[PDB]
Curated annotation (Swiss-Prot), chains A, B:
It is a peripheral membrane protein. NCBIfam families: ATP_synt_epsi, PRK00571.1-4. Gene3D superfamilies: ATP synthase delta/epsilon subunit, C-terminal domain, F0F1 ATP synthase delta/epsilon subunit, N-terminal. One of its GO terms (cellular component) is plasma membrane. Belongs to the ATPase epsilon chain family. F-type ATPases have 2 components, CF(1) - the catalytic core - and CF(0) - the membrane proton channel. CF(1) has five subunits: alpha(3), beta(3), gamma(1), delta(1), epsilon(1). CF(0) has three main subunits: a, b and c. This is ATP synthase epsilon chain. It comes from the Bacteria. GO terms for biological process: proton motive force-driven ATP synthesis; proton motive force-driven plasma membrane ATP synthesis.
Amino acid sequence: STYHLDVVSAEQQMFSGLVEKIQVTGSEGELGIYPGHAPLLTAIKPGMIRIVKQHGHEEFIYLSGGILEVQPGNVTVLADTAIRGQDLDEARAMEAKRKAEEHISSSHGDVDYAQASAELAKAIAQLRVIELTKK
Amino acid sequence: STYHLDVVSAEQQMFSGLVEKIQVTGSEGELGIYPGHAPLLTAIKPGMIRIVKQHGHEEFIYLSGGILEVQPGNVTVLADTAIRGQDLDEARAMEAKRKAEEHISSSHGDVDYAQASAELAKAIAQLRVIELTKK
């Protein structure tokens, strides 16, 4: 019915308590972790983690990347950079998307494109969290 | 009597408004910036910025590093990683200090020491902000 979740970064402890479920942006694709899920160790791609706290209440946190560790009764997500949805800045994310979008139409190769493509994923991800929080 | 301050990072806008003064950890040493200060462009060393908002009220933000831009009437600090003092985690910072302190007594050279020495500066800095916030 519930399991323990620890969302931490090198400096902060974003979350620590009981949740009913979470959705992360795993290495293999979108992941849904429930109570009693089988052990797992995966890398997180720049995106977000939806935390469904007990009583069916949500909290959104943007993850630039990190590591997901599912273990018996305990789940831990070590984040590179983690920012709460209410703290993201729309103008700042919008800005990033622009710098990236033009980095794309500057691609003199296929190496610099994948890097501008990465930059964009992060920007798109931030905007998704921003909008998901408003609701 | 007052000047405009913008504290921003790639994703967030930590602060934006009128302040009476600020103290950053500049490239040359601790800096005090007041209204009417002469133009400056400096790099910020891992440390903190004390924001003295109008009415003599303080707010502490940890900076892993960044850039300080003093211009007529407007002051901007672009941060690499910025975390509000109330969001730092003492156990997490304490942890970092330990990993660093032992990285030091592992120094097989003078190259790896300066890197462990850097890691420690950041950890010490975080703890300073944490304690400065409590007060």
